[PDB]
Design a protein around this ligand. Structure first.
Ligand SMILES: C[S@@+](CC[C@H](N)C(=O)[O-])C[C@H]1O[C@@H](n2cnc3c(N)ncnc32)[C@H](O)[C@@H]1O
Length: 257
């Protein structure tokens, strides 16, 4: 049994109180108060539509994925990754796909900087989408469950779905459950063919073991995964540490050339 699986069982043992104290212990998170207030008033400039704009920003500002050209955003939800990429100088097109409907977030229209190169499309199940030419492949799909075997299957399905989109392009792909042995085997095969590394984002909650497979990096996958399981296990053992609060992103306004 893996370190990750032991973490999961401990997480499933927690009360809602213990869980709520645990999920943010020691993490980093952005302050959404201003954005939530302005979005509630219908403002369409400056605000990120979700915490996701800041999450992708963390990887980009570290050169782990460098978005360029035609960007595909699989599972875009409200659009936080798509709107963020739309303001980056090398990006020329952003196409987001998400399921919508009951249980799922719908794209939110915005006029943040570069909005004119974004098209977000709801009613799209990516597991039925034919792959398209693109220079950056982004994917943030993976629903948590209390069952890690369910999570194993959802993770493997995503990795099998993304591979035909990958053709010597930039990428950032969520790996919901990276500690199950079968997932490891797949990731190791994928890194051999397409390179990259798995990376833990500091803005991810302790309630998920998600890691992101990014195109610009090298490293040992098993080692990076076990380090996260050790980190998440250690955070059970202490009284809640309040999260390191950071400033949310300002996505600006206006068209781009
Ligand atoms: C964590 S959210 C992504 C957030 C987004 N990156 C942002 O910045 O706001 C994951 C999204 O994937 C969508 N999703 C889940 N399964 C999907 C599927 N099979 N096809 C398309 N979208 C899916 C969910 O509805 C959800 O909106």
């Amino acid at each position: 049994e893996t370190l990750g699986e032991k973490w999961k069982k401990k997480l499933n043992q927690l009360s809602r109180k213990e869980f709520d104290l645990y999920k943010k212990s020691g993490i980093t998170e952005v302050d959404r108060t201003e954005a939530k207030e302005g979005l509630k008033r219908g403002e369409t400039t400056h605000h990120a539509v979700s915490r996701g704009s800041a999450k992708l920003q963390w990887f980009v500002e570290r050169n782990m994925v460098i978005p360029e050209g035609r960007v595909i955003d699989l599972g875009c939800g409200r659009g936080g990754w798509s709107y963020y990429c739309a303001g980056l100088k090398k990006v020329t097109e952003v196409r987001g796909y998400t399921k919508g409907g009951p249980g799922h977030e719908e794209p939110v229209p915005m006029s943040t900087y570069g909005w004119n190169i974004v098209k977000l499309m709801s009613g799209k199940d990516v597991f039925y989408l034919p792959p398209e030419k693109c220079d950056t492949l982004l994917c943030d799909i993976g629903e948590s469950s209390p069952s890690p075997t369910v999570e194993e299957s959802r993770t493997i399905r995503v990795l099998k779905m993304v591979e035909p989109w990958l053709k010597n392009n930039q990428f950032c792909i969520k790996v919901l459950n990276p500690y199950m042995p079968t997932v490891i085997e797949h990731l190791e095969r994928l890194q051999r063919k397409h390179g990259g590394m798995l990376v833990r984002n500091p803005l991810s909650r302790n309630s998920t073991h998600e890691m992101y497979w990014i195109s610009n990096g090298t490293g040992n996958i098993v080692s990076s995964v076990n380090m996260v399981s050790r980190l998440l296990l250690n955070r059970f053992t202490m009284t809640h540490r309040r999260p390191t609060i950071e400033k949310d992103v300002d996505l600006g306004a206006g068209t781009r050339h």
